[PDB]
Design a protein around this ligand. Sequence first.
Ligand SMILES: NC(=O)c1ccc[n+]([C@@H]2O[C@H](COP(=O)([O-])OP(=O)(O)OC[C@H]3O[C@@H](n4cnc5c(N)ncnc54)[C@H](OP(=O)(O)O)[C@@H]3O)[C@@H](O)[C@H]2O)c1
Ligand SMILES: NC(=O)c1ccc[n+]([C@@H]2O[C@H](COP(=O)([O-])OP(=O)(O)OC[C@H]3O[C@@H](n4cnc5c(N)ncnc54)[C@H](OP(=O)(O)O)[C@@H]3O)[C@@H](O)[C@H]2O)c1
Lengths: 306, 306
Amino acid sequence: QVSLGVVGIGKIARDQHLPAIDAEPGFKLTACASRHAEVTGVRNYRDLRALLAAERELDAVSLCAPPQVRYAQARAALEAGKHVMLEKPPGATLGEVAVLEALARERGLTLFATWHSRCASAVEPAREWLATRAIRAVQVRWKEDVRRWHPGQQWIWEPGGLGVFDPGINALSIVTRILPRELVLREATLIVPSDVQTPIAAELDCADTDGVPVRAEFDWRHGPVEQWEIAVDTADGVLAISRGGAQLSIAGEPVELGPEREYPALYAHFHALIARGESDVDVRPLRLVADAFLFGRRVQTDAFGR
Amino acid sequence: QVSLGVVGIGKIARDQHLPAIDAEPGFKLTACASRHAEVTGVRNYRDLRALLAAERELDAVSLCAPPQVRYAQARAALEAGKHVMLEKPPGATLGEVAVLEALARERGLTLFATWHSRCASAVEPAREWLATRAIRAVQVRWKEDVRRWHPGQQWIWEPGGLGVFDPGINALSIVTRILPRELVLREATLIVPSDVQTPIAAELDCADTDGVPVRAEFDWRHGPVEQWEIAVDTADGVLAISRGGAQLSIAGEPVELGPEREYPALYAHFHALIARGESDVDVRPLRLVADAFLFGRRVQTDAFGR
Ligand SMILES: NC(=O)c1ccc[n+]([C@@H]2O[C@H](COP(=O)([O-])OP(=O)(O)OC[C@H]3O[C@@H](n4cnc5c(N)ncnc54)[C@H](OP(=O)(O)O)[C@@H]3O)[C@@H](O)[C@H]2O)c1
Ligand SMILES: NC(=O)c1ccc[n+]([C@@H]2O[C@H](COP(=O)([O-])OP(=O)(O)OC[C@H]3O[C@@H](n4cnc5c(N)ncnc54)[C@H](OP(=O)(O)O)[C@@H]3O)[C@@H](O)[C@H]2O)c1
């Protein structure tokens, strides 16, 4: 049993992390760090530094806080000799993560940048279907009401919070896993409300290296349709991922899929990486987003307001 | 003796590229591509695709055009079997540069992402002196009036053109060569005029992996003093680079250096890279600018004039 600590007991820690952990006998939940929350049945600390000082035999740490505080938490846990699992996005910058990964490597420690939507049930069968085939186009639609799905949340609007790319990077994490060739950004448009620091919507125009166009529209504004779809057009028909990876159809037939166990799968993968002395740090979805922030044209819109 | 083609005969090609090539026996200037200019004594083409179709025995290509068109040109040159030298920034995005690097390896071709300010005479002496001293803090000041130094240039203000980071990235390419440890961006502020798509001023708060603060101020606005300095505080005194890397002082005492031969040295390195069969693609200065566009707070400022 690998001794596990968890940092930042908020929405996703209680909804997904704690249940999955308790159902991984491969980890044993030992301690938690959170400023304004406590988890019963374990030792609890206010911050990770006080956890690391007191939990000398702790093996591993999993970061469930916002991405603007991940680098300092990941760095401290690796200093103290712990394996590290990162919620997504793996950091607020690319430079952060490169340093974390060199640091983990240097100490033989496991660093896991997680992309939970990559563990959706449609991803692996769609990747197998798409390996050989000739692809013609990809389109992504990722639209939801931020007020309905992130009520009152602030850090999403602060520097390093990604804005609409916080769920949008999920779709990019699927796209980059299911297509075989790499993506280049050709053009992007970011749409930023004048009272926040991150985009509320974006359109992305990419191409993979054989020139296959990949288009994506991200939108958090009130709208008629909430959708989480990726549609790959091929000589052999259309592969259509919907419901955020939980549903798949190939050429117009449903594919039977095992039920959704994203976070169970991630923790099983984190436990296997520790067992093999390995790391899994794929930052390509973040790199694409960075390219959008670096290369995209930016447009001002009406205030998000209250 | 390498057969060479130059694309984009504008200001830097006239000012530095062509006279460096002419004084480098390693290269024979064979052909130029430019839509609105012609070079004497060589075959000239309106664009690179035409040049590649008639220049069969050509070996290598140097790209001197704006960054937004660098990818399509470099990929074509690499796909036609030519070594490629990139002006800086090596691209408008990180993803496009990773694609070029991978493509040149697959073909065995040399790809050289150049940074002319890394060849300034102060850089290597400064790198040598700093390699194992105790560094306390680093300060960077890169300030000049764009109306004086870049008059009538417009691609600097378009997406992918970097704005004040076009000269700013030069400083970043020196800091990143002379400091032994990697940089993490902790905070950035970008000052963007309402009528352009790139910033005219920026502040970066960085730290190296030992915790050394690295601060940089970039400014293209009207101000008191032009300056292009990198000052490094150590327990053994201050190392100060000034005049864009042409001047170096150590503990108040100047150090005397080779005359400025930045592009002669860039082209000597390119030839040597082709001799060895290697590439040189250091995108760290660009990755850091991308972290600032991603993570930085943005402030709209008054219209620049255009
Ligand atoms: N549907 C989802 O929500 C979802 C799904 C998948 C992945 N994620 C990812 O998981 C992360 C956050 O989603 P969320 O549920 O965790 O939002 P969250 O509830 O706002 O953040 C989780 C907790 O981190 C702590 N926190 C906030 N600021 C902190 C700071 N400066 N220092 C230390 N701790 C701080 C807070 O707990 P304390 O106040 O007690 O310290 C917060 O309760 C994000 O990276 C997100 O993209 C979310
Ligand atoms: N000037 C400096 O201070 C300086 C110094 C060192 C390095 N650099 C770097 O060198 C690169 C070029 O800089 P520059 O100062 O020479 O800019 P520039 O004066 O605009 O010259 C670039 C030339 O590329 C061609 N061009 C412009 N748009 C093009 C397009 N869509 N497609 C094809 N060709 C196009 C143009 O030649 P045609 O119109 O004839 O086709 C232009 O004359 C930049 O990446 C810059 O960062 C600049």
